[PDB]
């Protein structure tokens, strides 16, 4: 079906340059106008760029004209954005959208690829096991956790038992402080589960090729 996939997001030094890509499938990329929409950390949506069906006609808002540049490769069905003269302001989640001819503007979006413009350096997270003292029971259930401390940038992935445990999970949003992120996740399983069969915390920080599976032991 109609699929849009943004790629290339990442950490970049100020003034640095990056290039986002948006692979469109499930529709005739050349017959549809395409756009770029960002979402700031404050969850504010900002229109970034729009380009006509046969390319050429590009529109850019006031803030990014001269630095950003939209283009498209209609043969490979790819939408591109050229980011130059980057600033901290530009740090956001970047979406690419499909225009519904004579209907609506952003008819279809993508998963989104985050780019972080900052002078901070990449730091690998520290993953710590979280279990109750002495493995102390709380009735018919047990809540386990996992703490990922001090990482940069934001993009981090955490799952339990490679995805087996998904039911009673609780991944808390990362809180930034001193140019480092901290995140945690809890999982509630019955008493007859954890002590019997170990639960593992799978953490992956792409930016630093970090990937660690920490088993929760009592």
């Amino acid at each position: 079906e109609v699929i849009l996939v943004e790629s290339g997001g990442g950490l970049v030094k100020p003034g640095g340059s990056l290039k986002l890509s948006c692979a469109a499938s499930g529709f005739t990329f050349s017959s549809y106008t395409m756009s770029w929409v960002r979402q700031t950390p404050e969850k504010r949506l900002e229109w970034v760029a729009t380009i006509s069906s046969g390319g050429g006609n590009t529109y850019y808002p006031d803030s990014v004209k001269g630095r950003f540049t939209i283009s498209r490769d209609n043969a490979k069905n790819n939408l591109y954005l050229q980011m130059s003269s980057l600033r901290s302001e530009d740090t956001a989640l970047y979406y690419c959208a499909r225009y519904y001819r004579y209907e609506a503007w952003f008819a279809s979006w993508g998963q989104g690829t985050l780019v972080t413009v900052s002078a901070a350096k990449t730091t690998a997270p520290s993953v710590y096991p979280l279990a109750p003292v002495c493995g102390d029971t709380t009735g018919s259930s047990v809540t386990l956790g996992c703490l990922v401390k001090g990482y940069f940038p934001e993009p981090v992935t955490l799952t339990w038992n490679s995805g087996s445990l998904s039911s009673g999970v609780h991944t808390f949003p990362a809180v930034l402080q001193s140019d480092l992120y901290t995140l945690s996740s809890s999982v509630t399983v019955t008493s007859s589960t954890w002590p019997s069969q170990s639960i593992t915390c799978n953490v992956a920080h792409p930016a630093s090729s970090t990937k660690v599976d920490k088993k929760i032991e009592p």
């Binding site: 969850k43 504010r44 949506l45 900002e46 229109w47 729009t50 529109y59 808002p61 006031d62 979406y95 519904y100 004579y102 209907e103 609506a104 503007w105 952003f106 008819a107 979006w109 993508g110 998963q111 989104g112 520290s126 710590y128 096991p129 979280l130 279990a131 109750p132 003292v133 002495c134 709380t138 809540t143 956790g145 703490l147 401390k149 609780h170 991944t171 808390f172 949003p173 990362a174 809180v175 402080q177 901290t182 995140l183 945690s184 809890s186 509630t188």
Partner: protein, 214 residues
């Protein structure tokens, strides 16, 4: 440029009730042709914002019948007639009839429910962390309501520590509750110097452990 203003920023509505969102522009935007572009989007927790109403009042494919965009005048209003748990998210009105395409601030929908106390749990620092010279004590306050809840950390039966890092998930679509974690971060030395660690939710809900290991 033309600015879109949404009211209210937050909206807590009872389940199965009716809801309305307002979005007024600083200038007239309805065209004398047949293409007034005023759209309403919804960003469900942890997902991309989807299209609901386009061209002031039209319903996009898939969008449940309960969604009606009335608009009109200078105040564009979205109307949710049968509010469901799956309708919690953030609604943003986007304008496109003026070159500088702008978006509204947003309206976070909150599903009202009966109060629910949190299932508090405290966790002592890991041996690994202590080895690196640090001690983070984590406490989880899962599935409660409303979001307004307090948590106090008490070291050695008195010390109300304040160097804590809190975090809240957004309302859960299943049960409409909230969850938060409080992580008190102190040094291995400052931690080794004490014994009891308590986590109080606020007739408070207390949870604590003793020692530095066990």
């Amino acid at each position: 440029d033309v600015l879109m203003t949404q009211t209210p920023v937050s909206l807590s509505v009872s389940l199965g009730d009716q809801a309305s969102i307002s979005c007024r522009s600083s200038q007239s935007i309805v065209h004398s042709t047949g293409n007034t572009y005023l759209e309403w989007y919804l960003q469900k927790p942890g997902q991309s914002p989807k299209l609901l109403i386009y061209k002031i009042s039209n319903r996009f494919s898939g969008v449940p019948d309960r969604f009606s965009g009335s608009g009109s005048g200078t105040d564009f209003t979205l109307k949710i007639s049968r509010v469901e748990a799956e309708d919690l998210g953030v609604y943003y009105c986007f304008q496109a009839s003026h070159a500088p395409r702008t978006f509204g601030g947003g309206t976070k929908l909150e599903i009202k429910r009966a109060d629910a106390a949190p299932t508090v749990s405290i966790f002592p620092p890991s041996s690994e962390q202590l080895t690196s010279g640090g001690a983070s004590v984590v406490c989880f306050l899962n599935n409660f309501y409303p979001k307004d809840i307090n948590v106090k950390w008490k070291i050695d039966g008195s010390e109300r520590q304040n160097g804590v890092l809190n975090s809240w998930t957004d309302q859960d679509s299943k049960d409409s509750t909230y969850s938060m974690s409080s992580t008190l971060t102190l040094t291995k030395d400052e931690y080794e110097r004490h014994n009891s660690y308590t986590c109080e939710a606020t007739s408070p809900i207390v949870k604590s452990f003793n020692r530095n290991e066990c």
